[PDB]
Amino acid sequence: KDGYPVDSKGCKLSCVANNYCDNQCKMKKASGGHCYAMSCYCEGLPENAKVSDSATNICG
């Protein structure tokens, strides 16, 4: 599946470059890792990946 990976709190990962996400997503059995709207997004994550379902999370 695809989506935005979160952190230990469940907040979207603030990405700043494609290479950064490209490497992260990869480690997460993903294939399309890019930085969109300062948010990392991997395409091909595992059905049990920990990503959000919206372009905004509930961080502090």
Swiss-Prot record:
Chief site of localization: secreted
Tissue expression remark: Expressed by the venom gland.
Claim: Lipid metabolism is one of the keywords in the record: no
A GO molecular-function descriptor: sodium channel inhibitor activity
One GO CC term, this protein: extracellular region
Location in the cell: Secreted
InterPro entries cross-referenced by the UniProt entry: LCN-type_CS_alpha_beta_dom (IPR044062), Scorpion_toxin-like (IPR003614), Scorpion_toxin-like_sf (IPR036574), Scorpion_toxinL (IPR018218), Scorpion_toxinL/defensin (IPR002061)
Biological process per Gene Ontology, one example term: defense response
Coiled coil, from the record: none
Disulfide pairings: C11-C59, C15-C35, C21-C40, C25-C42
Record family assignment: Belongs to the long (4 C-C) scorpion toxin superfamily. Sodium channel inhibitor family.
Name under which the protein is recorded: Alpha-like toxin CsEv5
